[PDB]
Amino acid sequence: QGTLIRVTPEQPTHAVCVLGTLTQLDICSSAPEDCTSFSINASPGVVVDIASTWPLDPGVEVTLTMKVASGSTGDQKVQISYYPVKALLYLTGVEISLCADITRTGKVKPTAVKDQRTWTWGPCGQGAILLVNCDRDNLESSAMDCEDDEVLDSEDLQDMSLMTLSTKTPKDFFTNHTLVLHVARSEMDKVRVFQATKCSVVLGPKWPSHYLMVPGGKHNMDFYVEALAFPDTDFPGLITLTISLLDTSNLELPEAVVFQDSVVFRVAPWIMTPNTQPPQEVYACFENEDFLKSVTTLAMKAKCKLTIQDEMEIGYIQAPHKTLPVVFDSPRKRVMGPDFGYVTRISGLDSFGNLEVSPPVTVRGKEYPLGRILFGDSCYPSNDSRQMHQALQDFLSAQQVQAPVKLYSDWLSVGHVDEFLSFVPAPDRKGFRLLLASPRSCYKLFQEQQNEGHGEALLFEGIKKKKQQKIKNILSNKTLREHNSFVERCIDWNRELLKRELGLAESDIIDIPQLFKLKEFSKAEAFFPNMVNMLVLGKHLGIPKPFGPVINGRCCLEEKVCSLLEPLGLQCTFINDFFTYHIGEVHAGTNVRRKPFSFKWWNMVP
């Protein structure tokens, strides 16, 4: 933001000055050796702040400041007299300002002095936000918008960030000078820049620099910027665009740089939405025709739109100008469309049933207003242990805003985290509760009902293909009781893990009755349909119907589940067929889209 000019008496000096930059003078280096003093006078447009004739000591600082842009080339003068011989200096005032939404308010602001071309997190920080163009507004084009080098629809401009170049110079100022917009060679494959007139490519992959065609006088120019890559292990998420003013008055000599200015964009990360957030839409996809009814009733009850899943997770990206949903598809078919993004980056833990996120929490000082991502892993790497692909773990950690927590889920047969934990909206305290499966909770009910005389109750009743099981001989099973004692020990481990990494007290956790049967390789499957895993649409739940032993009319499992959830204000609605069997895979067909956080992601300091 500075420029040093050296004037000499033998030859007049011509210098360009950009409004907003400090300019100092070097009059000592080329001063007459017999001269011991000097004095300076200049035109009204030129202001001198030097710190009545001065003794030409090297320590003196001659500062120059120009009021406004020049109407002609060298229309401002500076006379330097030595003590006599005079030295001349012809100055031209020009305005070169590169502007972007650095205040994160939706409106473009010029370069303001506190930013210093550095991106900073927080409410008191500065830096523009750039979105990944990962959707498909153009209904005709089947590919992604960022895969080509053209702007097809006007609706696509809403997704791109705006950048303006306003210039006020003399008319004949551009016959010997030139402007060039450029980006680093490492960042060029992540960003593409358009010039609006009607849009053409100036910057992008294999095009790091481009000469600009501007006229003299007062002229502003609009640019539209798009991102082509999410933040990852090889891309922190910053893009820096730069304008440069070059002197080309010498035909034989290469171009000389006179002025540079930059703006720094940050690529918006992918953010998940917890169950506590309101649902915008419910997605569903031969069987369970009656369950489609029970599903449609719940959506109509919770006032949520329904349209006709475990392999994908619906997130979003947001900027001050645009906010749209983006679906992350597991590696284990892309739904691109208007305001619908898509991103893609093999073990059984790579599926997104193993991928969940907590409500906003505060853990021992650190605030997580966007919650924390939760995924499962082994307790320690062995030959027979599984883990989520490192490439996937890196992506989630690269998004930064939602600090991932590694849980233990390798004990389960499937290995997903959603099958032993869940979150529900609560009226008091934190505003939510943590639902954890509990064998101890399930056993207590069965033993209490055995003492109640109804120990002859047969489970699996009213089922087409199932074996009746009595409460009496279920409690008398020494094999099942040992396994559910081992499973409880696993959930207890994760219980204390979540209590520490989410800052949860026991008064925020609710134990839900559930027991498991050991499979081959000592893996764990649910003995009856997993109730802790469900469909949460606000105050309305959609728990799978447990089909537990009938006692005095209604199922005792549902009675306890309701007894724990009704005081929260949660309307329970048990579904006849939530999960379905294949061929040997148990799946669920429901998936939700929820309203993004009101909290802007760029305001937290990771």
Ligand X SMILES: CCn1c(-c2nc3cc(C(=O)N4CCC[C@@H](N)C4)cc(OC)c3n2C)cc2cccnc21
Footprint on this chain of Ca ion (rule: CB under 5 A): 133, 135, 137, 145, 148, 156, 159, 339, 352, 355-356
DSSP state letter for 44: T
What beta strand segments (E) does 52-118 contain?
Answer: 62-66, 76-82, 85-100
Binder to a second copy among 108, 184, 212, 475 (CB under 8 A)?
A: 184
Residue placing its CB nearer to ligand X in the complex, 156 or 488: 488
Helix, strand or coil, per DSSP, at residue 42: strand
Residue placing its CB nearer to ligand X in the complex, 224 or 547: 547
Stretch that binds a second copy, among 29-37, 78-86, 298-306, 338-346 (CB under 8 A): 29-37
- Can residue 529 be called a binding residue for ligand X (CB under 6 A)? yes
- Can residue 525 be called a binding residue for ligand X (CB under 6 A)? yes
Residue placing its CB nearer to Ca ion in the complex, 145 or 410: 145
- Can residue 353 be called a binding residue for ligand X (CB under 6 A)? yes
Residue placing its CB nearer to a second copy in the complex, 364 or 467: 364
Provide the token pair at 314: 């619906």
Provide the token pair at 287: 């069987």
Q: Measured from the CB of residue 119, what is the shortest distance to a second copy in angstroms?
A: 16
Please list every residue from 585 through 604 that binds ligand X, using CB under 6 A: 586
Helix, strand or coil, per DSSP, at residue 145: helix
What beta strand segments (E) does 373-494 contain?
Answer: 373-377, 405-408, 421-425, 432-438, 458-459, 469-470
Report how far residue 118's alpha carbon sits from residue 264's, in angstroms, rounded to the nearest whole number.
7
Q: Measured from the CB of residue 575, what is the shortest distance to ligand X in angstroms?
A: 10
Report how far residue 91's alpha carbon sits from residue 75's, in angstroms, rounded to the nearest whole number.
7
- Number of helical (H) and strand (E) elements in the chain, helices listed first: 6, 39
Report how far residue 282's alpha carbon sits from residue 295's, in angstroms, rounded to the nearest whole number.
9
Amino acid at 440: R
Asked if 346 and 261 touch (Cβ cutoff 8 Å), the reply is: no
- Phi, psi (rounded to 5 degrees) for 575: -105, 135
- Can residue 148 be called a binding residue for a second copy (CB under 8 A)? no
What beta strand segments (E) does 439-584 contain?
Answer: 458-459, 469-470, 509-513, 516-518, 524-526, 550-551, 554-555, 579-582
- Can residue 58 be called a binding residue for a second copy (CB under 8 A)? yes
Stretch that binds a second copy, among 148-156, 182-190, 463-471, 584-592 (CB under 8 A): 182-190
Closest chain position to Ca ion (CB): 159
Nearest CA-CA partner of 236 in 404, 402, 395? 395
Binder to ligand X among 458, 461, 579, 603 (CB under 6 A)?
A: 579
Stretch that binds ligand X, among 95-103, 224-232, 435-443, 522-530 (CB under 6 A): 522-530
Sign for the CA dihedral angle at 517, 519, 525, 528 comes to negative
Binder to ligand X among 104, 416, 433, 560 (CB under 6 A)?
A: 416
DSSP state letter for 440: H
Nearest CA-CA partner of 538 in 500, 580, 516, 569? 569
Q: Measured from the CB of residue 15, what is the shortest distance to ligand X in angstroms?
A: 30
- Can residue 182 be called a binding residue for a second copy (CB under 8 A)? yes
Stretch that binds a second copy, among 147-155, 179-187, 349-357, 418-426 (CB under 8 A): 179-187
Residue placing its CB nearer to Ca ion in the complex, 455 or 544: 544
Closest chain position to ligand X (CB): 353
How many residues line the site for a second copy (CB under 8 A)? 53
Report how far residue 490's alpha carbon sits from residue 498's, in angstroms, rounded to the nearest whole number.
13
Amino acid at 441: S
Residue placing its CB nearer to a second copy in the complex, 134 or 421: 421
Residue placing its CB nearer to a second copy in the complex, 3 or 309: 3
- Can residue 530 be called a binding residue for ligand X (CB under 6 A)? yes
β-bridge pairing 62-66 and 22-26 = antiparallel
Residue placing its CB nearer to ligand X in the complex, 194 or 528: 528
Binder to a second copy among 90, 121, 486, 579 (CB under 8 A)?
A: 486
Asked if 283 and 591 touch (Cβ cutoff 8 Å), the reply is: yes
Stretch that binds ligand X, among 85-93, 317-325, 341-349, 528-536 (CB under 6 A): 528-536
Binder to a second copy among 44, 55, 254, 462 (CB under 8 A)?
A: 254
User: Which contacts of 32-37 are long-range, i.e. CB under 8 A and separated by 24 or more positions?
Assistant: 32/82, 32/85, 35/82, 35/83, 35/85, 36/83, 37/82, 37/83
Report how far residue 139's alpha carbon sits from residue 151's, in angstroms, rounded to the nearest whole number.
13
186, interface contact from ligand X, a second copy, Ca ion, none, CB < 5-8 Å by kind:
a second copy
Provide the token pair at 209: 């620099």
- Can residue 414 be called a binding residue for ligand X (CB under 6 A)? yes
How many residues line the site for ligand X (CB under 6 A)? 15
By CB under 6 A, name the binding residues for ligand X.
Answer: 310, 353, 413-414, 416, 418-419, 525-526, 528-530, 533, 579, 586
- Interface with a second copy by CB under 8 A: which residues? 1-4, 6, 29-30, 33, 58-59, 180, 182, 184-186, 208-209, 233-234, 242, 244, 250, 253-254, 256-257, 260, 379-382, 387, 390, 408, 411, 440, 444, 448, 482-483, 486, 489-490, 492-493, 495-496, 499-500, 506-507, 511, 522
